[PDB]
Amino acid sequence: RDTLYEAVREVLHGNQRKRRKFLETVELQISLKNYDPQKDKRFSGTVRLKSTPRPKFSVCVLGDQQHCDEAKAVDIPHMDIEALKKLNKNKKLVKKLAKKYDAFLASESLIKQIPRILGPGLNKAGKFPSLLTHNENMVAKVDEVKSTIKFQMKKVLCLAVAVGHVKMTDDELVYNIHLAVNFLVSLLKKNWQNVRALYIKSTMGKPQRLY
RNA sequence: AGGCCCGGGCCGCCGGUGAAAUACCACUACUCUGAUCGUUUUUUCACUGACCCGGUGAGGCGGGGGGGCGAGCCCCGAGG
Ligand SMILES: [Mg+2]
């Protein structure tokens, strides 16, 4: 506990701020051990955090008549089916969208449009839209949900994701790490056994080596 | 979203492009190399003395000597 998480916290406070002008976002860098990536089940997970957004902005864009109205209401982006279809030109416009929009939403438009009318590419970028809108929620809550941490294992024995903000500093911080490190252990094939090291990195340099 | 200038400096997340990169930072993974007699793990070959087998009334084995009917080679005084 305090032996392990408090010591490293203090390092970030003394270091970091003075080290680099401008503030980035902390990320939890993990290293697996004694695991076979392609010969064994891939563990994919998605969990919430307390009340802090890891991504700075660009929450999501939706596609539906009413959701687009509520979109112009509280959200900057309100794309619609007919506006969305750009065909072959979309390939590059959608690559730009993947570079921009951190996430995407769709009220039943995604079921048919992305495989067909929108096209592929969102999957290639790893960002397919979510059916989080179903005419049964308010998009403010959906935007609060889009500020989470998502896990999927790949060939590299390491998955790194937004775990904190240099600008936001509270005990809650590590409580997000505590939630995150446990969440991997929960969905890992055989628990803590296959974790070689854990790292929390913010901005530039190497500030943490948990376990 | 050039870290990095003397109170005025540049790589690129610019645009393209490829299936994904082109600042900056990390994180691994793998292939190679020296070191650590640090940890163990093993493979081949050879020996004989345990042990095994066969033969025999356990009858001539091993090394050396001596001699050719000797053979190649040497100063040959054509030769101990
Ligand atoms: Mg005999």
Query: Helix or strand or coil: residue A34?
Result: coil
Q: What gap in Å lies between CA A179 and CA A63, rounded to an integer?
A: 32
Six-digit token pair at A47? 């969990």
- Solving technique: cryo-EM
Q: Return the closest-CA partner of residue A153 out of A183, A121, A115, A132.
A: A183
Taking alpha carbons only, the member of A55, A59, A56 closest to residue A101 is: A59
Which residues partner with A150 through β-bridges? A46
A125 nearest nt, CA–C1': B20
Question: CA of A34: how far to CAs of A40, A44, A157, in Å?
Answer: 11, 18, 10
CB atoms within 10 A of CB A66: 11
Nucleotide nearest A32, CA–C1', reads B28
Compute, in angstroms, the gap from residue A61 CA to the centroid of ligand 1: 104
Q: How many Å does it take to go from CA A35 to C1' B44?
A: 36
**CA A108, CA A127: separation in Å to the nearest integer?**
16
Which of the 8 DSSP states describes residue A160? E
Which chain B positions come under 7 Å from a protein C-beta? 1-4, 13-17, 19-20, 24-29
Sign of the CA dihedral running A155, A94, A27, A146 = negative
How far is the first Cα of chain A from the last one, in angstroms, to the nearest whole number? 12
For the beta carbon of residue A49, count every other beta carbon within 10 angstroms.
20
d(CA A191, CA A211): 14
Resolution in A: 2.6
Residue A78 CA to residue A73 CA, distance in Å, equals 9
Matching residue, tokens 């403010």: A140
Quote the tokens at residue A64.
């539906």
Footprint of strand B on the protein (CB under 7 A): A 20-22, 24, 29-31, 92, 95-96, 99, 121, 124, 156-158, 160, 196-197, 199, 201, 203-206
Largest CA distance in chain A: 57
Ligand 1 centroid vs A52 CA: distance in angstroms? 100
